[PDB]
Ligand SMILES: *Cc1c(COP(=O)(O)O)cnc(C)c1O
């Protein structure tokens with residue numbers, strides 16, 4: 039019974055990112071998702087929704103892929119699990135590793151280490167950067183620079199990297215080794231710069247942080263090529279070239295968080311490829327498997343892998359491992375996911391239909407007095423709402439405009455996300471989305487928005 | 493083509509817990525596992541092995557359960573994933589949560605929060621204990637006490653909780669908020685002590701740590717009911733009763749790490765049930781799914797859940813979540829796993845055949861001059877080897893006796909683990925293991941051991 043389900047939920051399930059009391063008490067009503075196909079999902083009540091956020095930037099090949107379910111089945115049946123400790127392996131993990139390196143990763147990458155979450159992958163990154171510096175005799179080169187409004191996960195170290203305050207509240211974060219520099223959102227500049235001027239500003243602010251802390255104390259800089267949860271923010275043109283030069287000058291490792299941007303989302307293999315970023319380390323999850331099974335990976339450059347090898351010769355086996363590291367079923371899911379991305383050229387579809395999404399959002403919302411900015415890249419897009427446009431001046435957060443539009447859209451059968459920063463409505467549809475589906479998405483969001491606007 | 497696999501592996505796969513250079517260079521040969529059935533696995537080759545470590549204390553219902561593969565398939569096909577943010581749900585996660593609380597958790601537990609690893613679950617625990625204290629207006633009550641030789645995971649915070657130095661080296665751990673008290677291994681007590689004396693020693697050492705740090709600054713104490721990777725160490729008689737009294741007196745939360753002990757391993761539902769532990773918080777993974785899919789959970793007491801609710805009313809939504817929190821496929825795997833544990837009464841089999849394992853290891857090894865100690869409980873057991881027994885004096889670690897026995901056992905078709913701490917050979921067979929299979933396991937390990945002992 040659906041009613042006893044919902045009581046069991048309220049009584050016993052602690053959800054992620056859900057108001058504990060309001061949920062437990064019934065004030066925040068629960069929604070049970072039971073099926074889905076293509077870009078549409080279905081709740082327990084039989085209501086169907088267009089999921090223009092692809093779960094959480096992650097159901098990239100779309101819902102209901104029997105091909106992946108069969109791949110998962112066949113592996114679960116043959117060998118669901120053995121460990122990968124002390125050189126042990128399984129077939130799928132071997133194939134997946136060489137495929138990630140040969141076909142998806144930028145040049146210079148060498149090794150892949152697996153977990154199950156974006157958060158655990160970034161945890162691994164910070165371990166590796168500390169290990170690297172310790173084996174090189176640099177015990178104080180340990181601080182990590184992240185950015186305001188960044189999202190890097192929800193643990194203690196990874197929640198510190200995260201530049202959104204909700205992940206810090208009552209958790210004593212950020213930790214002391216994590217420092218935050220500026221969010222590269224041109225729309226929000228010092229308030230009259232050229233794009234190039236704003237880049238130079240971001241560069242000087244980073245240079246100031248480095249000077250205050252001391253370059254010899256900074257191990258790494260971590261960043262999303264395009265900001266996701268912080269509010270769908272492409273980098274300014276020239277940003278990545280200029281930031282990379284600063285990091286190289288100060289011998290600071292670069293970690294590209296590709297959890298959202300990875301595996302076709304922007305119309306390129308990765309955000310790194312898209313923007314000419316040459317990271318030392320890369321974090322992936324989400325579109326790695328299109329969420330069909332949980333899997334994360336850390337991709338390691340030749341340079342860093344060489345120091346890891348060196349560490350092992352001098353100090354023996356590195357103490358790092360998860361029980362389910364390289365889980366056969368999860369690896370098999372990833373292989374089928376990649377087969378589908380590649381065969382259907384969904385990276386191309388993301389570029390193509392993603393540009394159409396940008397176009398249609400601009401046409402629909404660009405001229406409107408309450409829309410401060412329309413922005414995006416590939417199959418990511420956002421609308422940022424402003425009380426005055428003009429003066430670039432945001433609504434009283436108590437008004438909750440982004441949230442009211444999202445709610446209205448949901449009533450009309452469309453899922454889009456109110457992002458945690460400001461009044462921002464985000465779009466991250468599956469990479470299989472068609473032009474017609476975009477027009478359908480935009481029509482509903484447009485109606486929703488007018489209803490709230492009035 | 494097997495050769496091309498192994499090259500691809502060496503070229504591109506960074507393994508957990510694997511010597512990086514020795515593996516990449518071919519000095520540490522790789523092993524590809526391709527199949528398995530019951531308690532036996534098969535490598536690429538075709539060599540078959542009795543897996544008396546059940547993967548990593550985790551393949552509890554045994555290998556090749558088509559029933560679980562079908563359960564995984566059916567969920568993957570119907571709905572592999574949606575998120576569980578902002579009150580969203582799927583039914584396997586709802587059923588699993590109420591089943592964990594009603595059927596497996598000790599009394600007083602209320603809510604379950606999901607991840608994918610033992611490590612992420614303990615990460616969540618520490619977040620929750622800090623949140624708890626912050627919403628109660630106790631900003632300084634934040635330190636965590638763990639134990640020497642404990643294993644709690646392999647992250648930064650969870651690697652700090654972990655009391656084994658290999659998880660610390662070149663990672664700048666433990667963090668300052670984590671303190672370690674003594675390992676409750678009677679066999680390594682300060683010499684001469686009675687079991688009861690050694691308990692009282694553990695108690696006084698904990699009391700000293702609490703006095704030095706200030707009880708006011710200590711949020712929680714985390715511990716495995718029985719130590720796993722640190723050496724298969726049951727707690728001394730009376731340990732848990734006495735430790736619990738100290739924690740209660742100082743208002744310190746107790747986190748039971750049931751990652752190994754959970755879901756039947758000791759012949760009880762949990763280590764907590766087994767030893768009368770009343771934790772505020774419990775961590776589970778491994779036997780939660782028998783490793784058929786990755787899943788972890790944090791089980792939360794009524795007391796702690798009440799404060800979490802309070803936090804949300806006063807401060808709004810707690811900022812905690814994993815994208816794959818409550819993953820439908822993983823939850824479905826767990827439900828089938830539980831169906832099998834319950835239907836086959838594998839908790840009972842673990843009690844029964846586990847006691848037999850203890851008996852048979854004692855009979856086979858108890859008298860031998862090179863075996864310092866035989867120990868265990870339920871379906872966990874270990875042999876600890878000593879150069880001198882009556883002097884309690886261990887071999888030169890470069891001799892690596894535990895590892896030589898393991899190697900010999902592997903040649904003879906048996907997988908048992910050389911544990912990282914001492915010269916210790918561990919046993920954690922699947923909970924479906926039979927008495928005859930135990931005798932088969934012990935016979936091979938006994939032969940292996942003689943070969944190494946006579947040398
Ligand atoms: C979602 C996300 C993470 C963390 O992933 P989890 O699987 O939720 O731990 C990290 N980085 C980015 C950019 C993300 O979007």
Ligand SMILES: *Cc1c(COP(=O)(O)O)cnc(C)c1O
Pocket residue numbers: 359360361362608609610611612643644645646716720721749750751752777778
């Ligand atoms: C194996 C283990 C962990 C960590 O589990 P992962 O799934 O490897 O992250 C934590 N606690 C205990 C007691 C364990 O045995």
Ligand SMILES: [Ca+2]
Pocket residue numbers: 446449450485486489
């Ligand atoms: Ca409407």
Ligand SMILES: [Ca+2]
Pocket residue numbers: 558559562
């Ligand atoms: Ca079947």
Ligand SMILES: [Ca+2]
Pocket residue numbers: 904936939
């Ligand atoms: Ca033999």
